[PDB]
């Protein structure tokens, strides 16, 4: 396991929609649970959503329980986070984090991509 | 932590360790049993025991319901487990009947198995201490065969029905009835006594055994294998099914034992601790038994393989001998058999509770109607006692041995464990199951469990079955007797009455569900939410 | 939500001194389900401590951790200039997952 790379950051109007991507390499992406973690401009981290290794179990943070939908493409080794209705508080830098073992924390982190609204 | 550890120590040991394992080890020639035993303890055994706990925890439902969620076609595995538990509960309590009879006979100034001045003894008797100076028989063995057991010359000769042991069976079944009706189980401060007394007794008996003047030969027999000659087909099924019987896995009670636990727990570590403690206590008490047998051989001048009965009686021959040779023998005899009855009842209650819960869950509309529970427990106990009576006749030992070999052990456990592992690994999917386990306990099973379910447990459970049929040899009791063909047919009748529940339910569901053939197969293969 | 808070919001420090930080939770969480991360300024976070005392593959041995129940901590035996970073305590026992407020070593 080596590498993670997010993409799709930028600027979108409030109430708009945007979709992030997170590529993976160096490990069997189809066998490790993935999580998204959000860093505010105040540098405070917050959890967003988790998708299990097989996509059967999905969990969301309350602040996005109905706004964001997480998904993955095992064949393409790519992770997706889709935002349907962005609130003003959603601006942050988004990290995709590999989290298969809950007793072993988020072992790997991507470079992260900024997201802004105005 | 302390209370959980004490519960782990106390709840899972049983007669499978203190009684069953020694006589199978002796029957298969000592150390040659330990090789296929440890080959079944890992690569099967422990990985199946973890899978059994996980299924119950995952479903939050008993044996009959979980397979409805995992794979509807194979729902018959629940009925297979339930009927295995029934056939077990019928005969398992006869051991407690014998233990109660020993306890009652212990209330004497001199133990009846110490000397053979008593009436039941043959003229061929020789007091064990004088035998070293033919057909001579030891007093303990012929006490067991003529006073307790009153053994007739075969299964063809049921003979009279012993009133004393019938009273013992009724007493134990009454205890079970009242306890389960009232819901009584050791949970209070009495646990510190109940859970620790068996280990105290086993340590004392191990100390007694190893200090005997003949222990070394017994241990050399017990640990030195016969790798070049002992590998007949019998030893391999005996070894694997000893693990699966001792762990009570395919019996389905462990699904209940897991469903009662809080999900947010490290079930993996708890299962590895429980299964290693059980196998360890079995292996440790092996030393006490076989040291006592080495002493018996040294004191009588016959090979260790010939000193004692190779059937169910090995414990009731060995421990009485040891307790005969300790200060105040009656005290220690009473302690031993009270300990044995506690160790037996703590298992009997769990098995009866699992059966009752499973059967009421199979028909809750009628069974859940208040007093229906109290009446149904009485019905089950009555029927179980009426079947147990058969094993109390003068020919009862042969029927008990037939049950012990075919009904709840042997090839049927290998059948059920094969289908469990096959379903979850290949039909349901090891990947799906690993994702589920990630969700429950937070981390995936890993390679040992994954391949143990995918390949090793299927391969072992097919190999032992095919090998048994390719080199088939009949059952014998103590090694000089031979069962008639009708008895072997009855044994296969029990085994198949357990095994066929899988094909029968498969075909029933394939016929009971509408639609095209492949559509029905797909509909019944797919899980339920 | 099981909110997590760290007491020493910011800490000045000099080389060689002993340093420690505290994490507290609104609800008790098992020892195995709490972790600490290091984030250097202008870089992605990295796992530092897991299961409350186990050290990651890239972390200097001078880091350590301890705790149980509702309160947890990590300590540095003797700091070095390379340790200047922000550290977040994080529980992993039940969703929603929560990260501590984070505490920065300012020197
Ligand atoms: N039948 C599974 C329980 C019997 S025992 O645990 O060996 O005493
Ligand atoms: Cl065992």
XYZ file of C-alpha atoms and ligand atoms in Angstrom:
763
model
C 0.000 0.000 0.000
C 1.549 3.255 -1.209
C -0.558 6.002 -2.658
C -3.830 7.930 -2.594
C -4.731 10.901 -4.809
C -7.830 13.098 -4.562
C -9.173 15.253 -7.388
C -12.104 17.487 -8.267
C -11.621 20.407 -5.881
C -12.594 23.939 -6.806
C -15.344 26.568 -6.550
C -19.110 26.046 -6.780
C -22.063 28.269 -5.945
C -23.859 27.772 -2.608
C -26.668 25.262 -2.946
C -24.903 23.735 -5.952
C -23.613 20.208 -6.453
C -20.118 18.793 -6.909
C -18.425 15.381 -6.922
C -14.949 14.507 -5.641
C -12.673 11.660 -6.734
C -9.930 9.798 -4.853
C -7.682 7.395 -6.757
C -5.789 4.554 -5.085
C -2.719 2.504 -5.962
C -0.337 -0.038 -4.466
C -2.969 -2.123 -2.657
C -6.077 -4.217 -3.327
C -8.523 -1.312 -3.266
C -11.440 -3.775 -3.331
C -10.510 -5.067 0.176
C -9.980 -1.974 2.379
C -12.677 0.283 3.814
C -12.326 3.951 2.868
C -13.281 7.130 4.721
C -13.487 10.843 3.933
C -12.228 13.370 6.494
C -12.857 17.112 6.235
C -10.506 19.881 7.408
C -12.063 23.308 7.967
C -10.243 26.603 7.352
C -9.835 26.585 11.139
C -7.707 23.431 10.688
C -10.304 21.413 12.618
C -10.821 17.891 11.284
C -14.280 16.357 10.996
C -15.508 12.990 9.757
C -17.808 12.838 6.730
C -18.610 9.294 5.602
C -17.319 5.723 5.508
C -17.816 2.969 2.921
C -16.897 -0.599 3.819
C -14.634 -2.759 1.674
C -17.558 -4.226 -0.278
C -19.885 -1.223 -0.337
C -22.629 -3.039 1.583
C -22.217 -0.973 4.777
C -22.217 2.829 4.581
C -22.164 5.368 7.416
C -22.562 9.148 7.337
C -21.870 11.989 9.723
C -25.055 13.699 10.877
C -24.070 17.021 9.298
C -24.169 15.343 5.848
C -26.580 12.485 6.581
C -28.817 13.455 3.656
C -26.561 15.741 1.620
C -23.583 13.561 0.616
C -23.573 10.113 -1.008
C -20.386 8.036 -0.960
C -19.596 5.375 -3.556
C -16.678 3.405 -4.976
C -15.584 1.671 -8.190
C -13.643 -1.483 -7.328
C -12.634 -2.201 -10.930
C -11.358 1.350 -11.493
C -9.767 1.599 -8.016
C -11.456 4.995 -7.585
C -13.480 6.385 -4.665
C -16.344 8.868 -5.099
C -17.988 11.431 -2.815
C -20.981 13.249 -4.335
C -22.475 16.398 -2.777
C -26.088 17.185 -3.690
C -26.703 20.475 -1.831
C -23.658 22.342 -0.522
C -24.194 24.537 2.532
C -21.930 27.507 3.221
C -20.190 25.516 5.979
C -19.063 22.772 3.566
C -15.935 24.605 2.367
C -12.882 22.639 3.476
C -9.958 20.511 2.330
C -11.097 16.927 1.795
C -8.905 13.903 2.538
C -9.696 10.310 1.614
C -8.318 8.026 4.324
C -7.852 4.256 4.334
C -9.455 2.754 7.426
C -9.894 -1.017 7.173
C -9.008 -1.839 10.804
C -10.920 0.195 13.383
C -8.397 -0.913 16.020
C -5.607 0.497 13.807
C -6.816 3.964 12.768
C -6.591 5.619 9.351
C -3.295 4.238 8.071
C -2.958 6.333 4.891
C -4.002 9.804 3.739
C -4.188 11.433 0.327
C -2.808 14.809 -0.690
C -6.248 16.404 -0.224
C -8.229 18.848 -2.375
C -9.725 22.210 -1.421
C -13.412 23.026 -1.921
C -14.915 26.523 -1.752
C -18.320 28.176 -2.151
C -19.322 31.804 -2.721
C -12.219 -8.365 33.494
C -11.974 -10.770 36.439
C -15.629 -11.828 36.286
C -15.475 -12.309 32.512
C -12.335 -14.439 32.848
C -13.974 -16.551 35.558
C -17.042 -17.082 33.367
C -14.784 -18.040 30.455
C -12.965 -20.570 32.634
C -16.104 -22.092 34.137
C -18.774 -22.123 31.452
C -17.144 -24.090 28.639
C -15.381 -27.087 30.220
C -17.521 -30.189 30.585
C -17.658 -33.965 30.497
C -16.306 -33.824 26.943
C -12.936 -33.116 28.558
C -13.011 -35.101 31.796
C -14.759 -38.231 30.447
C -14.970 -38.458 26.662
C -11.485 -37.498 25.460
C -9.561 -39.989 27.668
C -11.482 -43.052 26.479
C -11.186 -42.082 22.813
C -7.450 -41.507 23.294
C -7.076 -44.890 25.003
C -9.293 -46.619 22.376
C -7.110 -45.316 19.503
C -3.834 -46.303 21.176
C -2.630 -43.271 23.114
C -0.298 -40.787 21.476
C -1.326 -41.614 17.913
C -4.560 -39.673 18.693
C -2.704 -36.378 19.419
C -1.383 -35.941 15.822
C -4.809 -35.946 14.018
C -6.261 -34.118 17.057
C -3.946 -31.077 16.667
C -4.372 -31.314 12.825
C -8.160 -30.816 13.517
C -7.748 -28.182 16.327
C -6.267 -25.651 13.822
C -7.318 -25.555 10.094
C -10.613 -26.750 11.497
C -11.955 -26.669 15.098
C -10.931 -23.133 16.244
C -11.824 -21.386 12.896
C -15.229 -23.175 12.883
C -15.827 -22.245 16.550
C -15.238 -18.560 15.713
C -17.565 -18.835 12.663
C -20.277 -20.363 14.897
C -20.162 -17.504 17.414
C -20.141 -14.930 14.604
C -23.228 -16.394 12.913
C -25.258 -16.170 16.116
C -24.049 -12.669 16.916
C -24.674 -11.540 13.325
C -28.241 -12.840 13.114
C -29.283 -12.103 16.708
C -31.347 -15.262 16.232
C -31.110 -18.961 16.956
C -29.917 -21.785 14.753
C -33.178 -22.113 12.840
C -33.340 -18.427 11.839
C -29.750 -17.441 10.984
C -29.511 -19.657 7.902
C -32.713 -18.008 6.670
C -30.718 -14.763 6.518
C -27.460 -16.279 5.250
C -28.658 -18.813 2.653
C -32.321 -19.936 2.591
C -31.605 -23.187 0.710
C -29.397 -24.515 3.522
C -31.862 -23.629 6.300
C -31.969 -27.364 7.060
C -28.678 -26.990 8.929
C -30.686 -25.564 11.825
C -32.869 -28.656 12.077
C -29.754 -30.817 11.750
C -28.229 -29.038 14.752
C -31.485 -29.238 16.720
C -31.884 -32.979 16.125
C -28.214 -33.530 16.986
C -28.839 -31.750 20.285
C -31.920 -33.903 20.876
C -30.079 -37.174 20.277
C -27.285 -35.894 22.508
C -29.546 -34.855 25.388
C -31.200 -38.281 25.289
C -27.977 -40.141 26.153
C -25.634 -37.522 27.653
C -27.536 -37.621 30.965
C -26.953 -41.362 31.461
C -23.396 -40.387 32.413
C -24.890 -38.322 35.231
C -27.072 -41.291 36.161
C -23.945 -43.418 36.606
C -22.234 -40.603 38.518
C -25.211 -40.309 40.875
C -25.161 -44.064 41.481
C -21.453 -43.871 42.337
C -22.170 -40.947 44.663
C -24.830 -42.927 46.526
C -22.589 -45.996 46.771
C -19.765 -43.806 48.124
C -21.689 -43.389 51.417
C -20.007 -46.345 53.123
C -17.199 -46.923 55.598
C -15.378 -48.911 52.887
C -15.781 -48.268 49.180
C -17.429 -51.204 47.349
C -14.750 -51.187 44.620
C -11.853 -51.446 47.105
C -12.038 -55.203 47.793
C -13.968 -58.110 46.282
C -15.470 -59.820 49.324
C -18.841 -58.539 48.061
C -21.563 -60.736 46.593
C -21.516 -59.571 42.956
C -17.880 -60.591 42.459
C -16.748 -63.574 40.390
C -14.497 -66.292 41.842
C -11.903 -65.138 39.291
C -11.261 -62.018 41.396
C -7.807 -61.030 42.571
C -7.195 -58.082 44.874
C -5.169 -55.656 42.787
C -2.260 -55.505 45.240
C -1.852 -59.310 45.244
C -2.324 -59.888 41.502
C 1.365 -59.409 40.633
C 2.296 -62.761 42.218
C -4.594 -65.963 33.929
C -8.248 -64.886 33.893
C -7.771 -62.791 37.056
C -9.997 -59.699 37.097
C -9.549 -56.476 39.066
C -12.265 -55.558 41.606
C -12.885 -52.090 40.142
C -13.551 -53.371 36.619
C -15.960 -56.118 37.651
C -17.702 -53.801 40.108
C -18.305 -51.451 37.158
C -19.434 -54.354 34.893
C -21.634 -56.324 37.421
C -22.901 -54.031 40.214
C -23.241 -50.654 38.492
C -23.693 -51.749 34.891
C -24.852 -55.419 35.225
C -23.577 -55.898 31.653
C -25.437 -58.572 29.633
C -23.612 -60.576 26.932
C -24.725 -58.257 24.129
C -27.123 -55.694 22.725
C -29.312 -58.659 21.727
C -29.927 -59.250 25.468
C -31.526 -56.154 27.041
C -32.321 -58.177 30.142
C -33.994 -56.549 33.112
C -34.358 -52.788 33.556
C -32.355 -51.647 36.578
C -34.600 -49.900 39.108
C -31.734 -48.063 40.840
C -30.304 -46.402 37.732
C -33.834 -45.667 36.515
C -34.326 -43.803 39.797
C -31.037 -41.988 39.179
C -32.138 -40.894 35.701
C -35.484 -39.721 37.063
C -33.709 -37.755 39.804
C -31.390 -35.977 37.375
C -34.220 -35.214 34.949
C -36.305 -33.818 37.808
C -33.384 -31.560 38.738
C -33.167 -30.369 35.133
C -36.930 -29.857 34.864
C -37.179 -27.743 38.014
C -34.015 -25.752 37.257
C -34.961 -24.823 33.701
C -38.586 -24.176 34.696
C -37.416 -21.816 37.453
C -34.605 -20.479 35.252
C -31.984 -21.479 37.822
C -28.334 -21.126 36.814
C -25.118 -20.369 38.674
C -24.719 -16.587 38.442
C -24.250 -15.451 42.043
C -21.367 -15.629 44.479
C -21.737 -19.415 44.157
C -19.850 -19.084 40.858
C -16.514 -18.762 42.665
C -17.127 -22.287 43.977
C -18.898 -23.863 41.000
C -16.460 -22.698 38.304
C -13.278 -23.463 40.277
C -14.123 -26.764 41.991
C -13.589 -28.858 38.806
C -10.085 -27.466 38.300
C -9.223 -28.029 41.962
C -10.313 -31.658 41.670
C -8.461 -32.168 38.384
C -5.250 -30.688 39.805
C -5.520 -32.910 42.885
C -6.095 -35.989 40.726
C -3.199 -35.085 38.420
C -0.944 -34.788 41.472
C -2.185 -38.170 42.710
C -1.637 -39.790 39.314
C 1.833 -38.511 38.509
C 3.095 -39.486 41.976
C 2.014 -43.096 41.414
C 4.873 -45.614 41.080
C 3.927 -46.438 37.468
C 3.175 -43.030 35.958
C 6.183 -42.961 33.634
C 5.033 -45.900 31.516
C 1.559 -44.393 31.250
C 2.917 -41.047 30.069
C 5.268 -42.759 27.599
C 2.250 -44.593 26.193
C 0.241 -41.359 26.194
C 2.763 -39.163 24.347
C 4.867 -41.535 22.209
C 2.945 -41.915 18.907
C 2.631 -44.920 16.572
C 2.811 -42.894 13.369
C 3.679 -45.933 11.230
C 0.810 -48.273 12.208
C -2.017 -46.383 13.981
C -3.289 -44.537 10.890
C -6.460 -46.552 10.300
C -9.611 -44.647 9.282
C -11.213 -44.737 12.742
C -8.654 -42.546 14.522
C -9.125 -39.619 12.069
C -12.924 -39.322 12.454
C -12.495 -39.901 16.233
C -9.960 -37.042 16.488
C -11.859 -34.505 14.351
C -15.265 -35.264 15.858
C -13.769 -35.093 19.348
C -12.875 -31.423 18.646
C -16.300 -30.696 17.175
C -18.108 -32.495 20.040
C -16.019 -30.850 22.755
C -16.595 -27.375 21.309
C -20.342 -28.163 20.890
C -20.140 -26.231 17.602
C -22.470 -28.124 15.244
C -24.884 -28.684 18.131
C -25.951 -25.081 17.484
C -25.972 -24.062 21.150
C -23.006 -21.780 20.448
C -25.206 -19.693 18.159
C -27.320 -18.979 21.241
C -24.195 -18.469 23.364
C -23.044 -15.797 20.913
C -26.412 -14.147 20.317
C -26.629 -13.411 24.060
C -23.343 -11.465 24.011
C -22.983 -7.741 23.414
C -21.850 -7.119 19.841
C -19.240 -4.458 20.719
C -16.705 -6.997 21.974
C -13.462 -8.595 20.767
C -15.146 -11.882 19.909
C -11.982 -13.096 18.148
C -9.791 -13.020 21.262
C -12.580 -14.460 23.419
C -13.086 -17.411 20.995
C -9.343 -18.140 20.762
C -9.103 -18.026 24.596
C -12.124 -20.286 25.131
C -11.108 -22.857 22.516
C -7.456 -23.022 23.677
C -8.553 -23.344 27.352
C -10.933 -26.201 26.506
C -8.329 -28.125 24.452
C -5.709 -27.446 27.130
C -7.778 -28.791 30.011
C -8.592 -31.892 27.959
C -4.932 -32.491 27.131
C -3.898 -31.859 30.777
C -6.403 -34.309 32.300
C -5.127 -36.835 29.777
C -2.034 -36.996 31.979
C -4.015 -37.891 35.102
C -5.927 -40.652 33.336
C -2.956 -42.233 31.598
C -0.637 -41.955 34.603
C -3.269 -43.850 36.582
C -3.407 -46.443 33.793
C 0.387 -46.730 33.842
C 0.179 -47.386 37.572
C -2.523 -50.008 36.978
C -0.336 -51.791 34.421
C 2.773 -51.605 36.605
C 0.840 -53.044 39.567
C -0.642 -55.976 37.599
C 1.861 -57.044 34.923
C -0.280 -56.568 31.805
C 0.266 -54.192 28.901
C -1.225 -50.734 29.368
C -3.649 -51.316 26.485
C -5.304 -54.168 28.416
C -5.690 -52.818 31.969
C -9.132 -51.132 31.547
C -12.269 -51.044 29.349
C -11.812 -49.176 26.014
C -15.521 -48.142 26.011
C -17.292 -45.295 27.935
C -16.255 -46.796 31.305
C -12.606 -45.595 31.281
C -13.224 -42.645 33.615
C -15.354 -44.715 36.020
C -12.554 -47.296 36.102
C -9.603 -44.904 36.416
C -10.709 -42.243 38.909
C -12.282 -44.666 41.432
C -8.917 -46.470 41.424
C -7.054 -43.236 42.177
C -9.473 -42.140 44.918
C -9.121 -45.578 46.507
C -5.510 -44.659 47.358
C -5.774 -41.311 49.153
C -6.290 -40.494 52.839
C -9.933 -40.958 53.797
C -10.998 -42.451 50.435
C -14.728 -41.865 51.005
C -14.269 -38.098 51.370
C -12.439 -37.787 48.057
C -14.831 -40.175 46.295
C -17.773 -38.012 47.356
C -15.916 -34.857 46.320
C -15.016 -36.333 42.931
C -18.535 -37.391 42.024
C -20.146 -34.192 43.335
C -17.663 -32.272 41.175
C -18.514 -34.513 38.219
C -22.253 -33.959 38.676
C -21.745 -30.184 38.849
C -19.569 -30.270 35.717
C -22.260 -32.308 33.963
C -25.269 -30.260 35.036
C -23.657 -26.953 34.066
C -23.628 -28.367 30.503
C -26.967 -30.196 30.613
C -28.782 -26.980 31.536
C -27.260 -25.135 28.571
C -28.103 -27.902 26.108
C -31.696 -28.188 27.352
C -32.155 -24.412 27.247
C -30.826 -24.270 23.688
C -33.143 -27.055 22.554
C -36.195 -25.502 24.204
C -35.452 -22.042 22.809
C -34.878 -23.430 19.310
C -38.066 -25.506 19.296
C -40.259 -22.692 20.637
C -38.709 -20.342 18.079
C -39.684 -22.941 15.460
C -43.347 -22.671 16.536
C -43.793 -19.597 18.754
C -47.529 -19.179 18.124
C -48.390 -22.239 20.236
C -45.330 -22.647 22.469
C -45.181 -19.033 23.709
C -48.659 -19.078 25.305
C -47.539 -18.621 28.915
C -47.902 -21.951 30.721
C -47.235 -23.591 27.347
C -43.530 -23.158 28.150
C -43.757 -24.961 31.493
C -45.797 -27.780 29.957
C -43.486 -28.119 26.936
C -40.356 -28.440 29.075
C -42.073 -31.231 31.013
C -43.019 -32.959 27.749
C -39.451 -32.791 26.435
C -38.008 -34.110 29.698
C -40.554 -36.938 29.821
C -39.760 -38.091 26.281
C -36.007 -37.813 26.881
C -36.295 -39.880 30.070
C -38.429 -42.513 28.337
C -35.723 -42.893 25.692
C -32.940 -42.861 28.296
C -34.565 -45.841 30.003
C -33.298 -48.051 27.165
C -29.671 -47.344 28.112
C -30.457 -48.430 31.697
C -31.252 -52.057 30.889
C -28.672 -54.758 31.496
C -27.835 -54.305 27.800
C -27.954 -50.526 28.145
C -24.198 -49.996 27.765
C -24.272 -51.266 24.192
C -27.091 -48.837 23.263
C -25.284 -45.984 25.023
C -22.075 -46.787 23.110
C -24.032 -46.918 19.851
C -25.514 -43.452 20.571
C -22.163 -42.034 21.681
C -20.525 -43.156 18.404
C -23.256 -42.467 15.779
C -25.878 -40.054 17.170
C -24.045 -36.851 18.190
C -20.475 -37.426 16.972
C -18.722 -39.157 14.128
C -19.436 -38.448 10.488
C -22.578 -36.348 11.044
C -20.623 -33.537 12.716
C -18.236 -33.614 9.734
C -21.286 -33.391 7.423
C -22.731 -30.363 9.204
C -19.354 -28.574 9.586
C -18.572 -29.190 5.892
C -21.857 -27.671 4.793
C -21.545 -24.695 7.167
C -18.055 -23.820 5.885
C -18.976 -24.559 2.255
C -22.060 -22.342 2.379
C -20.409 -19.376 4.050
C -17.164 -19.596 2.057
C -18.480 -20.289 -1.464
C -22.258 -19.726 -1.660
C -22.630 -16.730 0.645
C -19.077 -15.594 -0.078
C -16.033 -15.313 2.140
C -15.716 -11.711 0.956
C -19.233 -10.789 2.087
C -18.682 -12.607 5.374
C -15.368 -10.799 5.931
C -17.088 -7.473 5.270
C -19.771 -8.416 7.800
C -17.110 -9.336 10.368
C -15.330 -6.041 9.697
C -18.635 -4.334 10.480
C -19.247 -6.335 13.665
C -15.843 -6.626 15.370
C -13.991 -3.938 13.394
C -11.379 -6.035 11.567
C -11.532 -8.807 8.937
C -10.955 -12.487 9.780
C -7.515 -12.605 8.165
C -5.861 -15.378 6.150
C -5.939 -18.236 8.704
C -9.733 -18.068 9.130
C -10.350 -17.238 5.441
C -8.457 -20.226 4.046
C -9.545 -22.501 6.934
C -13.158 -21.907 5.812
C -12.405 -21.887 2.059
C -10.186 -24.961 1.679
C -8.826 -26.666 4.811
C -12.119 -27.433 6.637
C -13.942 -28.577 3.451
C -10.908 -30.750 2.495
C -10.573 -32.379 5.964
C -14.312 -33.015 6.359
C -14.477 -34.634 2.878
C -11.252 -36.591 3.315
C -12.176 -38.180 6.655
C -15.627 -39.155 5.336
C -14.338 -40.651 2.079
C -11.462 -42.372 3.901
C -13.911 -43.865 6.400
C -16.031 -45.327 3.616
C -13.016 -46.524 1.595
C -11.558 -48.442 4.583
C -14.780 -49.051 6.590
C -14.592 -51.020 9.884
C -17.590 -51.604 12.230
C -18.075 -50.494 15.870
C -17.032 -52.957 18.676
C -17.564 -51.577 22.282
C -14.685 -53.000 24.433
C -12.437 -54.482 21.747
C -13.490 -58.208 22.054
C -17.237 -57.621 21.278
C -18.904 -57.203 17.809
C -22.180 -55.404 17.082
C -24.792 -57.208 14.912
C -25.749 -55.779 11.541
C -29.105 -54.495 12.814
C -27.343 -52.443 15.499
C -25.013 -50.883 12.888
C -28.151 -50.157 10.815
C -29.698 -48.412 13.816
C -26.528 -46.356 14.245
C -26.621 -45.269 10.615
C -30.334 -44.601 11.111
C -29.465 -42.048 13.798
C -26.590 -40.537 11.823
C -28.712 -40.202 8.683
C -31.700 -38.893 10.647
C -29.336 -36.066 11.520
C -27.573 -35.695 8.161
C -30.497 -35.852 5.711
C -32.065 -32.671 7.103
C -29.967 -30.705 4.595
C -31.085 -32.463 1.352
C -34.664 -32.762 2.595
C -35.027 -29.049 3.322
C -33.245 -28.161 0.074
C -35.690 -30.210 -1.999
C -38.709 -29.092 0.052
C -37.885 -25.423 -0.492
C -37.069 -25.984 -4.173
C -40.536 -27.537 -4.543
C -42.469 -25.224 -2.196
C -41.403 -22.015 -4.005
C -43.101 -20.934 -7.236
C -41.397 -19.970 -10.486
C -38.946 -21.497 -12.964
C -36.318 -23.877 -11.630
C -33.322 -21.547 -11.917
C -35.447 -18.618 -10.744
C -36.297 -20.549 -7.577
C -32.649 -21.536 -7.101
C -31.592 -17.887 -7.373
C -34.429 -16.767 -5.084
C -33.403 -19.232 -2.370
C -29.637 -18.762 -2.737
C -29.748 -14.992 -2.257
C -29.509 -13.680 1.348
C -32.190 -11.822 3.300
C -31.727 -8.417 4.909
C -22.220 12.502 19.091
C -19.341 11.506 21.388
C -17.463 14.817 21.342
C -13.722 14.704 22.071
C -11.771 17.628 23.559
C -8.061 18.178 24.260
C -7.090 20.317 27.247
C -3.815 22.095 26.201
C -5.035 23.972 23.136
C -1.536 25.305 22.368
C 1.865 24.722 23.965
C 5.194 26.515 23.743
C 8.229 24.254 23.961
C 12.014 24.128 23.618
C 14.310 21.256 22.610
C 14.927 18.539 25.188
C 11.956 19.255 27.461
C 9.373 16.623 28.343
C 5.927 17.246 26.845
C 2.512 15.600 27.193
C -1.026 16.174 25.900
C -4.471 15.054 27.081
C -7.619 13.806 25.331
C -11.032 13.589 27.016
C -14.304 12.207 25.645
C -17.956 12.925 26.348
C -18.390 9.148 26.708
C -15.964 6.374 27.583
C -14.448 4.444 24.671
C -12.405 1.257 24.664
C -8.624 1.488 24.751
C -8.322 -0.280 21.387
C -10.560 2.281 19.625
C -8.581 5.504 20.206
C -5.769 6.861 18.039
C -3.518 9.899 17.625
C -2.443 11.596 14.388
C 0.396 13.977 13.524
C -0.099 16.791 11.005
C 2.859 18.928 9.997
C 1.952 22.463 8.965
C 0.943 22.462 5.311
C 0.844 18.667 4.931
C -1.606 15.792 5.248
C -2.108 14.085 8.633
C -0.373 10.795 9.384
C -1.141 8.039 11.873
C 1.061 8.337 14.946
C -0.400 6.192 17.745
C -3.050 3.473 17.610
C -4.731 1.310 20.244
C -3.659 4.008 22.698
C -0.046 2.874 23.101
C 1.098 1.251 19.859
C 3.502 3.336 17.797
C 3.273 3.741 14.028
C 5.994 2.585 11.640
C 7.533 6.030 11.083
C 7.252 7.600 14.540
C 10.323 8.155 16.762
C 10.510 5.913 19.824
C 10.356 8.959 22.123
C 6.571 9.082 21.652
C 4.329 7.135 24.020
C 0.710 6.931 25.086
C -1.546 5.749 27.872
C -5.086 6.040 29.161
C -8.425 4.299 29.641
C -12.137 4.980 29.871
C -13.016 8.641 29.357
C -9.531 10.222 29.352
C -6.414 9.490 27.296
C -2.964 11.006 26.813
C 0.341 10.798 24.969
C 3.762 11.990 26.136
C 7.156 12.767 24.588
C 10.180 11.590 26.562
C 12.354 14.428 25.210
C 11.255 16.707 22.372
C 13.206 17.644 19.254
C 12.751 20.398 16.688
C 11.308 17.855 14.238
C 8.320 17.256 16.553
C 6.711 20.655 15.831
C 3.236 19.659 14.604
C -0.453 19.444 15.534
C -1.698 16.227 17.153
C -5.321 15.036 17.116
C -6.852 12.432 19.390
C -9.544 10.394 17.646
C -12.011 7.794 18.884
C -13.061 4.895 16.641
C -15.573 3.032 18.843
C -18.854 4.163 17.280
C -20.245 6.418 14.582
C -20.215 9.349 14.032
C -16.419 9.364 14.353
C -14.975 12.378 16.161
C -11.560 14.053 16.174
C -10.263 16.062 19.109
C -9.774 19.807 18.890
C -6.059 19.252 18.206
C -3.045 20.710 20.027
C 0.041 22.263 18.425
C 3.677 22.254 19.548
C 4.667 25.836 18.736
C 8.467 25.472 18.988
N -22.135 -31.013 23.887
C -21.268 -29.868 23.932
C -21.000 -29.705 25.380
C -20.478 -30.993 25.913
S -19.008 -30.423 26.690
O -18.776 -28.950 26.556
O -17.822 -31.231 26.357
O -18.990 -30.765 28.144
Cl -11.014 -31.790 23.710
